[PDB]
Amino acid sequence: ADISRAEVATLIQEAYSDTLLAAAKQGSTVLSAFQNVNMGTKTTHLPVLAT
Amino acid sequence: LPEAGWVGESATEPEGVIPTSKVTWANRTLVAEEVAVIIPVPEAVIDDATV
Amino acid sequence: LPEAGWVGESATEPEGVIPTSKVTWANRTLVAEEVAVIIPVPEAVIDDATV
Amino acid sequence: LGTGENQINLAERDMVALRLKARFAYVLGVSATSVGANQTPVGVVTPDVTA
């Protein structure tokens, strides 16, 4: 005598939305606060005044 | 499945009234499952073969 | 969120192996629901009125 | 509108009605952020029940 939404099973499809998916990414703090010294080797030596 | 009925021309008798009926559906699923094999062979055997 | 680690150099030690890690996701849903009202009025009242 | 003793047949009583309706859903994007898992994006100032 009547058709309910449970009786129409999967003739009604469920949809998708990525509108919550896109999280923004945060860089390193020290790579923007301080100088980025370019290196071409494992070890660099820096002399400093000590006495 | 719904069921229909024969209906008289009347504005007063119960036989003048068209029956209501429902239709209903259920769900079945295709679920994909993986079948696979690995066939190892010497690279020399593969390089040697003309077929 | 995934986790990185600091890594040595060796072919033999437990350090020098890069750590494995993981990213995961979850589901949130919009489910539509109906809000409604019926407002009945005599049609003579609609014709009689100045607005 | 209505049934039994409460019944209004709009056509024969020379009435009309407006049915107003909408369908709405709501979602709150509780998720991970760069600071950690399961972070709620909403806070509240509750009223003063003490001072």
- Annotate D1-51 with DSSP letters as a single string: ---GGG---TTTTTEEEEEEEEEE------EEETTEEEE-S-------S--
φ and ψ at residue D17, rounded to 5 degrees: -145, 155
CA–CA separation, B20 vs B3, rounded Å?
Answer: 9
* Straight-line distance from the first to the last Cα atom of chain C, in angstroms, rounded to the nearest whole number: 61
Q: Do C35 and D16 touch (CB under 8 A)?
A: no
Q: Do C40 and D25 touch (CB under 8 A)?
A: no
Q: Do the Cβ atoms of D17 and C39 come closer than 8 Å? A: yes
| Residue D32 CB-density burial (10 A; 0-12 exposed, 13-18 middle, 19+ buried) | middle
Q: Count chain A–chain D contacts defined by CB atoms under 8 A.
A: 10
Distance of CA B20 to the CA centre of its chain: 27
Q: Do the Cβ atoms of A30 and A37 come closer than 8 Å? A: no
CA–CA separation, A9 vs C6, rounded Å?
Answer: 52
CA–CA separation, A19 vs D25, rounded Å?
Answer: 14
Name residues whose C-beta falls within 8 Å of residue A27's C-beta, 6 or more positions apart in sequence: none
**Resolution, Å (one decimal):** 2.9
Q: Do the Cβ atoms of C37 and D20 come closer than 8 Å? A: yes
Residue at A31: amino acid letter: L
CA–CA separation, B25 vs A7, rounded Å?
Answer: 6
CA–CA separation, C28 vs D32, rounded Å?
Answer: 13
- Nearest CB to A26; choose among D29, D32, D34: D34
